[PDB]
Amino acid sequence: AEFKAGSAKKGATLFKTRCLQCHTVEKGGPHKVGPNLHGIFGRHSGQAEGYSYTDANIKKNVLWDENNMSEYLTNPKKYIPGTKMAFGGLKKEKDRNDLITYLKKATE
């Protein structure tokens, strides 16, 4: 994909309604169905401490950045075949840009 910085204020609303059910962003934050996302950018996949991932998410070994995250969030199951989740993706590019703008700051 091709990320363009958007609205982190809209990104925070999108995280609450589309991600927060399964994830947290705070340092030391708890894992829910999905892993806590603190430090996700600039780190390889399957490395949230204390979270047990599928072989698919571990074997992907993607170094998370703004662009591959955008591609991933479009359809996680297409990007990482074998990943297990009741999530189909964030289809609108504007949403992905807004979400990632917020996420880059929230997980820092």
Ligand code: HEC
């Ligand atoms: C529950 C229905 C979920 C929603 C909604 C979202 N995600 Fe998720 N995510 C979930 C699980 C169970 C997992 C782990 C899957 C596995 O194969 O083990 C994940 C994983 C991620 C990751 C990868 C983390 C890593 O360390 O590699 C990211 C980056 C991620 N999820 C982000 C994310 C965002 C931003 C969401 C809202 C757009 C979101 N997920 C929705 C479960 C669920």
